[PDB]
Design a protein around this nucleic acid. Sequence first.
RNA 1: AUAAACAUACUUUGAAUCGGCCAAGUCUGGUAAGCAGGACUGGCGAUGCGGGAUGAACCGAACGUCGAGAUAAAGUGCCAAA
RNA 2: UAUAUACGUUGUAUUUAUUAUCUCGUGUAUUACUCUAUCAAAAGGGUAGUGAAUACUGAGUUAACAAAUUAAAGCAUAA
Lengths: 204, 51, 51, 106, 132
Amino acid sequence: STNNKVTVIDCHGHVLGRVASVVAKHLLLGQKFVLVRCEDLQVCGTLKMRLVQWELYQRKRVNTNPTRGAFHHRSPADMVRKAVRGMLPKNNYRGKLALKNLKCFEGCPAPYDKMKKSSIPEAAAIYSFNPTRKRTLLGELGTAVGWKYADVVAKNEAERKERAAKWYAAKQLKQKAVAEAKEKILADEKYKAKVAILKKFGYA
Amino acid sequence: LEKLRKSIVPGAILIIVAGKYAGKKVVFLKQCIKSGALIVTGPFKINGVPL
Amino acid sequence: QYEAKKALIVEKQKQVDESVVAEIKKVPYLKEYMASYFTLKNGDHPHLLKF
Amino acid sequence: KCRLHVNAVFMGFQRAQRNQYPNVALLQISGVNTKEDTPFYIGKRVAYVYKVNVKKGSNKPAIRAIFGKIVAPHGNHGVVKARFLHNLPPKAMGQNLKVFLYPSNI
Amino acid sequence: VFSRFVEVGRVVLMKTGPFASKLAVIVEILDHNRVLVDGPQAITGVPRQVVNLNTISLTSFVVNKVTRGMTHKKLCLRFTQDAIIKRFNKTATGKAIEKRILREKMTDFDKFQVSIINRKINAAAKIAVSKK
RNA sequence: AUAAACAUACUUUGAAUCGGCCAAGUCUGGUAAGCAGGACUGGCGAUGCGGGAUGAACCGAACGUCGAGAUAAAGUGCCAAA
RNA sequence: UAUAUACGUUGUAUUUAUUAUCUCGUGUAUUACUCUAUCAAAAGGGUAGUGAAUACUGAGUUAACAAAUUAAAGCAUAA
């Protein structure tokens, strides 16, 4: 067959490098990936430790022409893309095609906010981290190094939560009423023949 | 003459998973003793699969 | 042409089906089971399937 | 009409750090997560079905397939080894393969 | 405050191994990582053995008057007094385990009926909810 | 005790070579050196292959053209098979 | 995530969850379904109508062999 669907990974409560390792392997397996909220990913170490690591990264620059040198993107979605690209084959068509299937966005844009979200249990922070190990969000580190769109994402996320809060409230009312109407059908006298099969196999 | 599996007995309902009638369900009658193949009628009034 | 001549004998031999068709309708939901295609839905792994 | 196959991903050729042996292809079957669920698929049929845009004046088929068999597992994670009539093209890495339910043993 | 503790008398559910989804009772705590479980071998079938805590799950039942190193003779007596088997079968985990046993013995024909029936019932229940 | 008949003993004629370098449960001169010079053995030179990212000498192992398997050094988050 | 209480709801993510095809039968109900109109709107929006699918919920016909994505050529007019 063909995989025309997109696997949407909610990067909230995940580790940057463990998410990247799993995605970079599956990108090579033909899957299409979108990593929403690539700014909520967590990295080990306090902000002071992370900023020192950034300064070492920012030092790498071609002496004779900095425009040829390493480009140090500050956007967290570009922080993740740098991590994933490092785990993919270099300078061959296989690794370029794999990276063409990956996207982060700093929030949840228009098509991906109503899609089914997935989680990577290997990359969950609650599993691979000592709770007292201090972590940093990619967004918080991004702002400290010059990411200008930190509060734009916060505003867009605040609207998204309040829209989903009433969609979920409305959908819950429908599901509660449907569940009751299903209980009247299951207990209905005329549906005994069908229900008997359902109970025999543990579905009722 | 191919030795049949123990599960294939006359009257058992089979599922064809290859060939033209893949996915169809047929009724096993007996084995073709001159070829070793199964003679199945996926009753034509129901399946549309002939003998 | 051959299908035209072979049709009258192919149809006739379906007198075998008269017993099995009647016995299929006796079991509830068996008639619908036999006509429908067999499919692997989502979550059915062949190594875990018992038929 | 119906689904009678399982998507297996052409992971790559049986290889080492720096060598590669295209006689055996490594497939990752969907739903098989351990080597202990592999014994069912040993000996099954596998087809790499691909589409070719033929010309109108050509009699070559639009749909072609390469058939093979699953022969052995590869590691403790449900990856299997497959041998095909002709070695799979390495431009098909990451593409999906059909694992059939025959030769049946049920 | 926490509701479930690793203690002597706490009924635990084995999650992995040859005795997965079988009930067990903690009888002695070796250290923070290992406990001795002797879910009565004459009742549940789990022998007295040392298990890492990563391979069990605590339940809400604690057998009364279970002491450290309680013998299998007496443990069986107290296990049936609190009716742990009866009570466990009424919990969400108890029904989840029973369902899995029911499903694993369903053939193709049985799964065919359920899908047909469940689709009609669910669709019928959706029709019965008005849109005003 | 063990091994040894395509064993053993050779005879004649002749080639090339006698700038060597490396390792170390070794040594001397030197503060020391990827320094100079030695004792025993294994190497590189003359040698590719698997591994140590890269490397004359390290580790595994020495090579007719191939197929299928068990392996060696060493590995099993991704690049990279596990 | 040391998550108010209670429960641990166990134990297979994507690809990959429709009972073969067509016809016959009457209304209701439902929909992140389609289209039209309108109010709105960088909405899985509201209102009215229409069709489609499904449930109440049927019955009948047919199947046997077969078959079931772009190529090749031009320059009249217009910006």
